[PDB]
Amino acid sequence: GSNMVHPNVICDGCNGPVVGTRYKCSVCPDYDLCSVCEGKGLHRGHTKLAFPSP
Ligand SMILES: NC(=[NH2+])NCCC[C@H](N)C(=O)O
Ligand SMILES: [Zn+2]
Ligand SMILES: [Zn+2]
User: Fold this and answer.
1) Zinc finger regions (ZZ-type), where?
2) How far is the CA of 19 from the centre of ligand 3 (A)?
3) 43 lines ligand 1 (CB under 6 A)
4) Separation of 42 CA from ligand 3 center, angstroms?
């Protein structure tokens, strides 16, 4: 399923897991958001790649 946890990823907005779509900053080396933090506009100024859980 595409709506599952991404293993070994911690959201840099809330320090929790990333379930469903992972938002990986394309600029910073190691920055990721979960869908809630992404929806709140955290880190909005950088382009990210958004992809489902493998
Ligand atoms: N509590 C944290 N935000 N730790 C840093 C996580 C860095 C990066 N998002 C990763 O999953 O590897
Ligand atoms: Zn989060
Ligand atoms: Zn960034």
Assistant:
1) 6-54
2) 20
3) no
4) 10
CA distance linking residue 3 with residue 26, whole number of Å: 22
Read off the tokens for 25. Answer: 């900053």
> What resolution does the deposited structure have, in angstroms?
1.4
* CA angle (41, 43, 45) in 5-degree steps: 95
Sequence-distant (6+) residues with CB within 8 A of 43 are 12, 13, 25, 31, 33, 37
Q: How was this structure determined?
A: X-ray
